[PDB]
């Protein structure tokens, strides 16, 4: 009962991807999750689901239609090459550290106080 069509298709050779406007129709349930989107783009274009990156859904008022964006790369050695790191961290293949931004600025102003090799020994 979930039908997904694509609009505005384009092949990026200089970005090694496909691109389209994903048009999901779900009259009768919630906005269907992006894990279920990628598996259905997998069987539609006959490709693996790991080269599929899908984002940007806003459901219409009334709710029988959405609109999203999607790109489908060639391999993961392109899909990790030209792709934002925050959308590589969604699935689980990228990890940022847990030092927050205020702890980074506070140390950089303390490392600015100290001259020489002891800059490595300022924090901890």
């Amino acid at each position: 009962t979930v039908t997904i069509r694509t609009r505005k298709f384009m092949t990026n050779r200089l970005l090694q991807r496909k691109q389209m406007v994903i048009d999901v129709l779900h009259p009768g349930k919630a906005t269907v999750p992006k894990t279920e989107i990628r598996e259905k783009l997998a069987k539609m274009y006959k490709t693996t689901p790991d080269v599929i990156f899908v984002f940007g859904f806003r459901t219409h008022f009334g709710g029988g239609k959405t609109t999203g964006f999607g790109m489908i790369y060639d391999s993961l050695d392109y899909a990790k090459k030209n792709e934002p790191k925050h959308r590589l961290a969604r699935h689980g293949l990228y990890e940022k550290k847990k030092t927050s931004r205020k702890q980074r600025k506070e140390r950089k102003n303390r490392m600015k106080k100290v001259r020489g090799t002891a800059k490595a020994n300022v924090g901890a």
């Binding site: 009259p27 219409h60 008022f61 009334g62 709710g63 029988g64």
Partner: protein
């Protein structure tokens, strides 16, 4: 410097005399006849109709066969024909001056739902619009001041997720069956 618009416009004008007995005699007929919510709804249709007439007087002072007066004149007629306030043979810019407020309140979706006969009363129709019962071309419209164009008039019907259409019953009848099945066992 922040990247945001700040372009906004008031859509109504309060009148110059506050307590005319005759203006209140006139404008309160417009709320009863067409199921409106306040005087600001009357005051905003008069202000849109004043804008169209004000651009109408500005084109009539131009010379005939002016390169601006033809293009702006043809566009303003087409914008009144497509909403269905001006007659499709009457489209001539000298007839825009002979046009009144009750013609816009017809093409309001609240009165179209009433005149299409899928509403019980004018005040029943606004309850239907607010409770998301009706749609216009596969699009559930929640707002009664929707100016229905002439192109999209024959597509007003009940929304697909509505018990007044072909859908599930509401909160009430689901509870009335649950106390009925609770009563029998």
């Amino acid at each position: 410097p922040v990247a945001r618009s700040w372009v906004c416009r008031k859509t109504y004008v309060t009148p110059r005399r506050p307590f005319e007995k005759s203006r209140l005699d006139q404008e309160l007929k417009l709320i009863g006849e067409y199921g409106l919510r306040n005087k600001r709804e009357v005051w905003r249709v008069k202000f849109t109709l004043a804008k169209i007439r004000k651009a109408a007087r500005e084109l009539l002072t131009l010379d005939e066969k002016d390169p601006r007066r033809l293009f702006e004149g043809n566009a303003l007629l087409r914008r009144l024909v497509r909403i269905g306030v001006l007659d499709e043979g009457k489209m001539k810019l000298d007839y825009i001056l002979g046009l009144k407020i009750e013609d816009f309140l017809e093409r309001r979706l609240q009165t179209q739902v009433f005149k299409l006969g899928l509403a019980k009363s004018i005040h029943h129709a606004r309850v239907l619009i607010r409770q998301r019962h009706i749609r216009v071309r596969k699009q559930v419209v929640n707002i009664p001041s929707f100016i229905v164009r002439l192109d999209s008039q024959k597509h007003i019907d009940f929304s697909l997720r509505s018990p007044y259409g072909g859908g599930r019953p509401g909160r009430v009848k689901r509870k009335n069956a649950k106390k009925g099945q609770g009563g029998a066992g």
